[PDB]
Design a protein around this ligand. Structure first.
Ligand SMILES: *[C@@H]1O[C@H](CO)[C@@H](O[C@@H]2O[C@H](CO)[C@@H](O[C@@H]3O[C@H](CO[C@H]4O[C@H](CO)[C@@H](O)[C@H](O)[C@@H]4O)[C@@H](O)[C@H](O[C@H]4O[C@H](CO)[C@@H](O)[C@H](O)[C@@H]4O)[C@@H]3O)[C@H](O)[C@H]2NC(C)=O)[C@H](O)[C@H]1NC(C)=O
Ligand SMILES: CC(=O)N[C@@H]1[C@@H](O)[C@H](O[C@@H]2O[C@H](CO)[C@H](O)[C@H](O[C@]3(C(=O)O)C[C@H](O)[C@@H](NC(C)=O)[C@H]([C@H](O)[C@H](O)CO)O3)[C@H]2O)[C@@H](CO)O[C@H]1O
Ligand SMILES: CC(=O)N[C@@H]1[C@@H](O)[C@H](O[C@@H]2O[C@H](CO)[C@H](O)[C@H](O[C@]3(C(=O)O)C[C@H](O)[C@@H](NC(C)=O)[C@H]([C@H](O)[C@H](O)CO)O3)[C@H]2O)[C@@H](CO)O[C@H]1O
Ligand SMILES: CC(=O)N[C@@H]1[C@@H](O)[C@H](O[C@@H]2O[C@H](CO)[C@H](O)[C@H](O[C@]3(C(=O)O)C[C@H](O)[C@@H](NC(C)=O)[C@H]([C@H](O)[C@H](O)CO)O3)[C@H]2O)[C@@H](CO)O[C@H]1O
Ligand SMILES: *[C@@H]1O[C@H](CO)[C@@H](O)[C@H](O)[C@H]1NC(C)=O
Ligand SMILES: *[C@@H]1O[C@H](CO)[C@@H](O)[C@H](O)[C@H]1NC(C)=O
Ligand SMILES: *[C@@H]1O[C@H](CO)[C@@H](O)[C@H](O)[C@H]1NC(C)=O
Ligand SMILES: *[C@@H]1O[C@H](CO)[C@@H](O)[C@H](O)[C@H]1NC(C)=O
Ligand SMILES: *[C@@H]1O[C@H](CO)[C@@H](O)[C@H](O)[C@H]1NC(C)=O
Lengths: 172, 320, 320, 172, 320, 172
């Protein structure tokens, strides 16, 4: 896709992540775990909610009948009405198809961008203490326990604390 | 070896297919419908002073066809017309009928005002017919009078009647012209004299002659009564001059305000509200589009030639 | 010293200009046209049981103008009308002509049914005119008869003719009224009596009087024959009562099914197919838009006021 | 452009690359070469094919004549038909212009994104063995022969094999 | 600690709110209006050869109502009709009025051509009325003549008047029919004879009878003069045959070219220019949309049901 | 947002930057600096001007009156005209709303992309001589005087000039 993350360098989604749209899986000495990211999830949901608020509505224009259901209509005027109504229906059918196609494309690419923005946030947080594996994971070159993993997820990880350890493990 | 943190996104086992600019078979985690396919099979009339006409045609409300006896006056914001409604008990038709029906179906009520027309002793003003029955008895259009000679064969006397609009709003006046089945019948009802009906206001002028040409029986009657109408402006007079063949108005109509005219087959429900109506009932959807019918009235979703149009409400579904 | 791997994209020598949201002159590697500018100068009639009327006007098919002798009956899915087609050989016009022509051009065929109209010895039903030539001689509309008095100057007899619709579908009946050029001509053809023609069905009635007013010559003729029409419903009858002036139907018409009416000057071509037609010919494009004409019929691309709209089919062209 | 590669950090396109939309050029001690990338090229082509399938079509609504070519029309109804047809033409002309403008913008940016996604895939493959030069190239800090270059192109390059050599060359 | 370089973007203290696809309240650095809300309260006529009709109604230009004396001929690219404009000084109406007014308001000028009609000694062609005052004296429509019997009570003679179109373009011919207030009045003006007016061309014919039926006084007059019209083609004749009741044309009209018809109450301004007009004035905006009125003429922005639609002309505003 | 810079990793805009839309602030031994970036600014402005040229215009179609202001109109045709005009108005109102919503989304995201493209250009220039702080700044690990800072703004900064100094400070 446009931003290269969802159906891109992220191989596939996680069916086991039911409390969020985006999140983390980690591996350390204590074991493995999973956690959803609130900020990225809500950013995506709020944008889709905004689309729904704009799209799911009708006009307030009051229309009256110009075609009799139960009696005859004039032949000349009736033909003009039929031409006009079918022309209007072609326009709305076209507009409806284009709207939903365009909006769907944007929704998919918007979701992709929020995945990438989360990935980019974490990359910059970790700084010189980790390396990208190419599949959406960061290999962290220091002991990073459950509290350390929480600090990465919380956006409170201080790279300076682990830099000496990490550069020794990375570069030797 | 290094510890690891992995970034990811959710997925579902069963995704939903949507169309995009570049892909007609795009799988997403969730989607929602934008085209309404369902209707309520009732006319949702909560919050509306509505009138269901039943077998009464709107035009029959002005002339007083028996089927319209409960609907000669009233007020409403919504007027419901039904299939096979009756306007004419006696064989005939209204000139400029479509414009008249539309005026009535745009109205918010009807009031009736007496013309005050009177007739001399040689006129029978209470002509009736088997075509227009009221409970097994011969009758006539309630807002009109069939004038004939009281003595069979005698010349109907020259008569002039005037209705003045004393109101500040325009009134709608209707009259009929009787077209007899034969010369003998014409002579019996109106005499051997040449017949002529003149109608004249400040804004309207016309002349009519009863015609006696041979024509087939409709409900056993070769005669016809055709209706004509005009608007009488505030303060103006309309003058009828006639010597046989006029079906004269006993009252005129005043159309009050505005209302929504609905043509539908659906029964009334006073417990639901709605702003959109069609032949089959009411559309209460929040969706922008619908595929029920191109013929709707009120505040409606737009009609589209489409069964479904799914709007994505989630990311691309990439299952495990 | 490091080795190098460079990522890049293609380019072309001759790029194409397109418009974007932000740039009127954006160069891309390739693009394709979305507005059709070309048309085939021919009516592509393959897969269509078509009728080219030539010099026959659609209304002439119902009355039987000499130019329409090969088009009095038939079936078709596509009907082609041409410029300067003749309906009225004798000077005149049809009342409600536009509605009638549209009905014929909407149809998928015409059938004819005998009226069975017969006339007594004092009527000459073989009236003809130089206006309507057939086989190098004076003739008349094939589906009608010009009735005049057998003896010149004598009163045309009071006559009744009744057509009964014994079919399950409505029949289209046409008749004419002759309007003489003078009182002397009127007297010669129909006598000195006052003339009156009445027509009456269950759903229609009208009365006509021949008018003898002075008027200029149209192809040497000050007389006029005006046409009138109505639909006779299944099981109904229509009664003509007349004493001079009626141009009476020998046959009535039945319009069958539906078809596409085309108005064009372009020649027929059975070698190829099309779904879209206009005055200049056929539009067989797969493109969504066209700039040939706003007046098209069938299944067509939408008309736009634009010479060209190029859709990009490639990336930005950034050449070397 | 939106993704910064095409008409961006990549200075220009390659007219010599006739077997693909995106690709590689390499330089090592043994020589130079060029090769197209199939997956990125096909991703871009398939999306453009998708647009053409949706756009290049007409409605199946059958219209009949409401304006006589060879005869006069009523003046009032004729004026209404003229107003209606010109109003409908203005809508379709506007919609066509907006459609093609919007689609052209998206096609150009989609193509840009596929260039960037290929560049990003290669960056993550090379890991700590190469550095970006800013012109769309990577300077590789170990001897990378034709087989090594091929392994980069076909997504089988294993950074760990060359990492020891590359880090010593990068740190000098 | 290291040196540093920071990348950033501008912001403004007072941002502007716009709507996006995903956000109804998005703050940006700048935006601009796309819907015009303001109108100039005048008709901007710079660069236009225009005619302001004032209290002259367009139809009055053809018949020559006193209010239209300065608007009987001319050329223009823009024609301005005002509210309560006078067409008929004498009580009456024009048949097919709406089509006629539209033809005049579509034109780019009117030229007048003499009919050359003359009348014998037993016709008084100088009939006048207090309804149509001119310079304080009883007068009449400038382009027509009220023909009455010279001798009061005497039969108006059987009269013929013929106009031939000698021009290469079609001419619009108008005439009136007088409908008297009573039998005594009818007898005084035209005699006791039965009255008939026939009008006949190649493409048109009709017959008219003055009607005497009772009707109310309009400015003290129960009489009516109704107008009729037709187009006489190049080379064609039109023949009037009449014996009382014809209001005969002394001139015919030729509509020249095309122009823009405006209906408005706003005053003329020759300093300002515009291509879009409405009832309340002019719209000379560059913006694509407007919310002033759905009823406009010329080259206009499209009407929309919105107060404002702000287009962003800058990035998201993120203040410090 | 889509590209993650404006209202993203860049915390806020600069009200004190009045001569451009995007730019630089710096700190070195010589002093504190600020300068606008011309190319990114003009790129954004030109794209917005392009939109305004396409959007701020009306059709050249000449419409005449089909509704009398001062006179009566026929009842059947009047209802048809009212229905048609209100249908046309609903279409144009909808088109206008969609146009401006779509254009505003694209304008905002386009501006975000130009910010990111400038940031990315600077990142690639600095190469291994600086590190990202996560807030849109680069900590430069060598003495970078006013001429050095100007070379970064000019796109003429050569990382090799300062690489030895920078790596010694980065690795400590
Ligand atoms: C980033 O990009 C910008 C824009 O391109 C560059 O800005 C240019 O920088 C050069 C070099 O500093 C400027 O050229 C210099 O102008 C000086 C001033 O000239 C005027 O005043 C003097 C003194 O009164 C007059 O002699 C002269 O005629 C002018 O009226 C000159 O003093 C400079 O000349 C001296 O240095 C040059 C070498 O640079 C020698 O050849 C000369 O002999 C002399 O000793 C010089 O001409 C130029 O004006 C700037 N342009 C703009 C538009 O601002 C930056 O250099 C660039 N930065 C980096 C780091 O790459
Ligand atoms: C021998 C034969 O078949 N003769 C029919 C003849 O019966 C028929 O006349 C009509 O027959 C019906 C049958 O129910 C009624 O009797 C009609 O009478 C009335 C009516 O009810 O309509 C009586 C009524 O009192 C009359 N009202 C007035 C005000 O005069 C009306 C009225 O005269 C007519 O409706 C006017 O057209 O008639 C009776 O007329 C005729 C039908 O045309 O046809 C013969 O062949
Ligand atoms: C000076 C002048 O032009 N006066 C015309 C006069 O010529 C015209 O007479 C008609 O002229 C045409 C010319 O081609 C024919 O000769 C008409 O003869 C026929 C006809 O062919 O139409 C003969 C035919 O047998 C007649 N048919 C019947 C059934 O009677 C018809 C018929 O009488 C008329 O068409 C009825 O109007 O005429 C010849 O009458 C007259 C009539 O148009 O008008 C003068 O002004
Ligand atoms: C007390 C009362 O209500 N009396 C009216 C009486 O006024 C009216 O007569 C008409 O009165 C008007 C004034 O309102 C004019 O004076 C009419 O006269 C003229 C006219 O000016 O229109 C004179 C003119 O010379 C006549 N012109 C010709 C060519 O004959 C015309 C003409 O006869 C008529 O307009 C034709 O309809 O009339 C005067 O007739 C009478 C009759 O309406 O009714 C009383 O109730
Ligand atoms: C208009 O369309 C309806 C529905 O398809 C059809 O029944 C009717 O015949 C059409 N009107 C005319 C005048 O043909
Ligand atoms: C889509 O989302 C809605 C709202 O969260 C949810 O209730 C529903 O389960 C989803 N749709 C389907 C078809 O599962
Ligand atoms: C552009 O595409 C067309 C097909 O529409 C093809 O014939 C042509 O070879 C292409 N040209 C270039 C330069 O790619
Ligand atoms: C409708 O437009 C056509 C083509 O421009 C023109 O010939 C015609 O005069 C217009 N119709 C009316 C009734 O003015
Ligand atoms: C059309 O709408 C106007 C208001 O814009 C209204 O006054 C008029 O009654 C409507 N026309 C008809 C024929 O009802």
């Amino acid at each position: 896709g446009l931003f290269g993350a969802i159906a891109g360098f992220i191989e596939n989604g996680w069916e086991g992540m039911v409390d969020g749209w985006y999140g983390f899986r980690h591996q350390n000495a204590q074991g493995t775990g999973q956690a959803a990211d609130y900020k990225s999830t809500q950013a995506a949901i709020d944008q889709i909610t905004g689309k729904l608020n704009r799209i799911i509505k009708k006009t307030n224009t009051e229309f009256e009948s110009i075609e009799s259901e139960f009696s005859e209509i004039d032949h000349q005027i009736g033909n003009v009405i039929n031409w006009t109504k079918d022309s209007i229906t072609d326009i709305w059918t076209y507009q409806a198809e284009l709207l939903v196609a365009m909006e769907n494309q944007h929704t998919i690419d918007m979701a992709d961008s929020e995945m990438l923005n989360l990935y980019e946030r974490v990359r910059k947080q970790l700084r010189q203490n980790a390396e990208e594996d190419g599949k959406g994971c960061f290999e962290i070159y220091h002991a990073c326990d459950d509290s350390c993993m929480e600090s990465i997820r919380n956006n409170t990880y201080n790279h300076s604390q682990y830099r000496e350890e990490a550069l020794l493990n990375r570069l030797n | 070896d290094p510890d690891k943190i992995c970034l990811g996104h959710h997925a579902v086992a069963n995704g939903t297919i949507v169309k995009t600019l570049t892909n007609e078979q795009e799988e997403v985690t969730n989607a929602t419908e934008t085209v309404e396919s369902t209707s309520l099979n009732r006319l949702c009339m909560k919050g509306r002073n509505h009138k269901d006409l039943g077998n009464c045609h709107p035009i029959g409300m002005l002339i007083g066809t028996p089927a319209c006896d409960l609907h000669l006056t009233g007020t409403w914001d919504t007027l419901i017309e039904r299939k096979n409604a009756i306007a004419y008990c006696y064989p005939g038709a209204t000139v400029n009928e479509k414009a008249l029906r539309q005026k009535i179906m745009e109205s918010g009520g009807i009031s009736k005002i007496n013309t005050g027309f009177t007739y001399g002793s040689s006129i029978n003003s209470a002509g009736t017919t088997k075509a227009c029955m009221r409970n097994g008895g011969n009758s006539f259009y309630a807002e009109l009078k069939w004038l004939v000679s009281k003595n069979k064969g005698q010349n109907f006397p020259q008569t002039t009647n005037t209705y003045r609009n004393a109101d500040t709003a325009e009134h709608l006046i209707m009259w009929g012209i009787h077209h007899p089945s034969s010369t003998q019948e014409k002579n019996d009802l109106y005499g051997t004299q040449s017949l002529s009906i003149s109608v004249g206001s400040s804004t309207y002028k016309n002349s009519f002659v009863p015609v006696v040409g041979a024509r087939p029986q409709v409900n056993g009657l070769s005669g016809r009564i055709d209706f004509h109408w005009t608007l009488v402006q505030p303060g103006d007079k309309i003058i009828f001059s006639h010597n046989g063949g006029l079906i004269a108005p006993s009252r005129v109509s005043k159309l009050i305000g505005r209302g929504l005219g609905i043509q539908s087959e659906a029964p009334i429900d006073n417990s639901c509200e709605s702003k959109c109506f069609w032949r089959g009932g009411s559309i209460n959807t929040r969706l922008p589009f619908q595929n029920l019918s191109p013929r709707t009235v009120g505040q409606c979703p737009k009609y589209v030639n489409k069964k479904s149009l799914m709007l994505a409400t989630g990311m691309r579904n990439v299952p495990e």
